Write a protein that binds this ligand. Sequence first.
Ligand SMILES: COc1cccc2[nH]c(C(=O)N[C@@H](CC(C)C)C(=O)N[C@@H](C[C@@H]3CCNC3=O)C(=O)c3nc4ccccc4s3)cc12
Ligand SMILES: COc1cccc2[nH]c(C(=O)N[C@@H](CC(C)C)C(=O)N[C@@H](C[C@@H]3CCNC3=O)C(=O)c3nc4ccccc4s3)cc12
Lengths: 303, 303
Amino acid sequence: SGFRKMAFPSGKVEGCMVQVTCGTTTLNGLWLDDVVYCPRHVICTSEDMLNPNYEDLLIRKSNHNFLVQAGNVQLRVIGHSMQNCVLKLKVDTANPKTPKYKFVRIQPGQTFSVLACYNGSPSGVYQCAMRPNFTIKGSFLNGSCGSVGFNIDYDCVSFCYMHHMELPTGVHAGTDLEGNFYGPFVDRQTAQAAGTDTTITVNVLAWLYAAVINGDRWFLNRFTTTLNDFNLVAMKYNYEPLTQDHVDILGPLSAQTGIAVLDMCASLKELLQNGMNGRTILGSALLEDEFTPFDVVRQCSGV
Amino acid sequence: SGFRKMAFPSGKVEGCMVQVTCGTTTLNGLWLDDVVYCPRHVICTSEDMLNPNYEDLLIRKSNHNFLVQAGNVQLRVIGHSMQNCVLKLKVDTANPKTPKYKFVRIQPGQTFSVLACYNGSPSGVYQCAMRPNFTIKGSFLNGSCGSVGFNIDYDCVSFCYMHHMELPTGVHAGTDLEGNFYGPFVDRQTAQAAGTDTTITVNVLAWLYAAVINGDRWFLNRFTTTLNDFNLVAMKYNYEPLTQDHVDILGPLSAQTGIAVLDMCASLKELLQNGMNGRTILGSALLEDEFTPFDVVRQCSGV
Ligand SMILES: COc1cccc2[nH]c(C(=O)N[C@@H](CC(C)C)C(=O)N[C@@H](C[C@@H]3CCNC3=O)C(=O)c3nc4ccccc4s3)cc12
Ligand SMILES: COc1cccc2[nH]c(C(=O)N[C@@H](CC(C)C)C(=O)N[C@@H](C[C@@H]3CCNC3=O)C(=O)c3nc4ccccc4s3)cc12
């Protein structure tokens, strides 16, 4: 038992991290088969960054302008192309550590592991959720762009994020591995705002089930509510609406604990209206919404 | 910027995880050079577990009773010996992925990354602190024993933990890689209690500095206190005493923020006496003590 924010083991992704240099700018890149993927603004100069015309900038480059380093070994670039906000560099060597992989775009409310890298060298791994407003609450410093986010299913790495930007509020924005931004952001040196955010209701309920499985029961009550009346309270507290599919997804956790989803919703309503009264749930003094139902089942099945 | 609980990249340790089977019992093991390390109670039968005489149990074993599997490839055991609560199995093949490593025992208050493994296969990575009472608040299921904890410095993996037990309270206990338990626990199928725990004061202060670096300032005040008077308040709230070495260790963070350690102590005293008044620090509604000063500097230097 125990419930901890947990990342996927990162070794399969570590074996794919390289360093891409163009001019004086060096970013992280992702080497899969004979292609390296990196943020396209590696081709920018300090003068270009306010509003680059990237098509123009890249037409003015050739293969020999890109230095790709995999460890101490330099990779020969033999082709280049634009992939929305990602640059694709064809190299003459397929990565021998390429895992089974795919490129999958995730939904707000889903989680993934981030492998933070600096100078092509992995530095830390952590978990985070795609917020409803398409930002992530990450931890990224100068030099981190091109770090990727991913999930692992059996042997397959599903890459879902490459890092590009930090907003003025200190949250982070990036693209899928096709170079398409999550949310209304652009890869320019400008201050950009996200939309208002909301709390991921289905994840809060999943985490309350995790708590019960781990012996935290003080917030439970004999009461139940209806879906409509729950969502009336949810809207008041800036919580997302709960769907029947959300209920159905919570079915297994409901069955494991013997607590109907709408019974747990009555606990959440009381927590939202009354606070915690100085108590904690799974070591937190607030309602946590960055664990999916899948994340919970992965740590709590069989407890 | 941003501050997230962050583990070390796990790939160097992933390349060392194997599976050790004795009889019907299979545990995780750690393969470094030509030695596999695992919890000694892999040799136990259901009848032996209440109070095994491990010396007797192991004398009754020979090399061919141990099946070591590294992936699909079986490793030939050519020697065995007892190492306190760890078994050492000599195999005929040195692990070609052995990283630079050492075995280091950590102090309460220090942090490390855990690579949770089941059936020799890595499943998740997370960070945790050795509590003052020598337990860890982990996430471990049936089948997890032999999973290890570690820190990485440059290229060197310092292994500090191998997992053995879950206490009745749901916290976890284990040994260093020499097989010596952290705390007053024994490897028997018995319910065991830890000593009372305390809050790691120096880590709370480190995390308050992390908060300031990340723009959370509401808890600051123009006041300062003395070390003696702070520790009088700390003792009241079950916080560890703050030493001058703790102050000295916090020096860099003090210099980066321009906030004297004893000035921050006055903020902590007010937080301890007044609570948060419904506000958060770095996304938490309680005072967090599982980040060391080193952990903070690693994410906040240069912000
Ligand atoms: C007036 O401009 C602002 C006003 C208010 C907030 C702001 N934020 C950013 C902004 O984020 N810019 C992007 C770059 C843009 C072009 C996508 C950027 O620096 N990305 C970083 C990751 C950042 C660093 C800090 N923590 C992070 O996550 C990345 O590593 C990259 N470095 C470089 C360096 C050179 C060339 C490319 C890259 S790409 C600008 C900005
Ligand atoms: C009346 O006995 C209790 C009363 C109240 C609380 C209790 N806790 C334990 C207790 O923890 N036992 C140890 C084993 C002891 C011998 C060190 C144990 O099961 N370790 C697990 C990791 C545990 C599983 C649940 N989550 C965890 O972390 C491990 O994987 C191992 N599995 C086996 C299986 C067979 C042989 C060896 C091992 S070693 C006993 C106990």
